[PDB]
Ligand binder design. Structure first.
Ligand SMILES: CC(C)c1cc(C(=O)N2Cc3ccc(CN4CCN(C)CC4)cc3C2)c(O)cc1O
Length: 221
């Protein structure tokens, strides 16, 4: 008791659940495209707030800088992507992250079943789920103007939660935290991240900064 937090439990829409189970339980080569999908989503969100701001500068009250940060953390085997885009409302999380059918799900599963490369995922409108190629749990923290901050979370298994987040306030935008699987820690390495960004995500119209830890003082190693 004491403190109270709204936390809502949802089932993924049946075909989304079937897709996630394929993604997780089937071997697929060329998983590095998960990063491309995340950066694409950030870029679209950033485009949206920039566009709205042409007409209403006040929409930038919550964060004037439009950018993306990539944060690998070897301490807890996470890779976080943060952007200062338009963010999502509660309904946007619920609609976009699982509760309803997505047009391309079935066809995408049929393509995978035929041997398509996982890279096609983005075209089918289910790109977010590529996170599950590398992560056993994904947390999405989001904040849209005129709404409160929310945190979506799922370790697959057919369920996800949406909670009102009173933690680290983001101002405005989305932060995706990938808890990487043991056989996917390569994505924590600066060398690998740089390689995949150069390969798949060139000319993103916003600065991308990689946070690195290379100067830690020995006295606090
Ligand atoms: C977790 C994924 C999905 C993700 C989302 C965002 C984010 O906050 N977004 C807000 C937003 C607004 C517009 C668009 C462009 N399209 C999307 C499809 N829609 C039906 C029409 C508008 C995209 C987004 C994504 C994010 O910043 C990063 C993420 O990884």
């Amino acid at each position: 008791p004491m403190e109270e937090e709204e936390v809502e439990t949802f089932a993924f829409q049946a075909e989304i659940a079937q897709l996630m189970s394929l993604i997780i339980n089937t071997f697929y080569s060329n998983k590095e495209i998960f990063l491309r999908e995340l950066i694409s989503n950030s870029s679209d969100a950033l485009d949206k707030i920039r566009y709205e701001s042409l007409t209403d500068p006040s929409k930038l009250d919550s964060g004037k800088e439009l950018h993306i940060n990539l944060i690998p953390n070897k301490q807890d085997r996470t890779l976080t992507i943060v952007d200062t885009g338009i963010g999502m409302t509660k309904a946007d999380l619920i609609n976009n992250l699982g509760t309803i059918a997505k047009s391309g799900t079935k066809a995408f599963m049929e393509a995978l079943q035929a041997g398509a490369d996982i890279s096609m995922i983005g075209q089918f409108g289910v790109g977010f789920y590529s996170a599950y190629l590398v992560a056993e749990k994904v947390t999405v923290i989001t904040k849209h103007n005129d709404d409160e901050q929310y945190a979506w979370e799922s370790s697959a298994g057919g369920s996800f939660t949406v909670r009102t987040d009173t933690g680290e306030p983001m101002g405005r935008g989305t932060k995706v935290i990938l808890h990487l699987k043991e056989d996917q820690t390569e994505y924590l390495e600066e060398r690998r991240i740089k390689e995949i960004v150069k390969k798949h995500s060139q000319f993103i119209g916003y600065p991308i900064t990689l946070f690195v830890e290379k100067e830690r003082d020995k006295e606090v190693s």
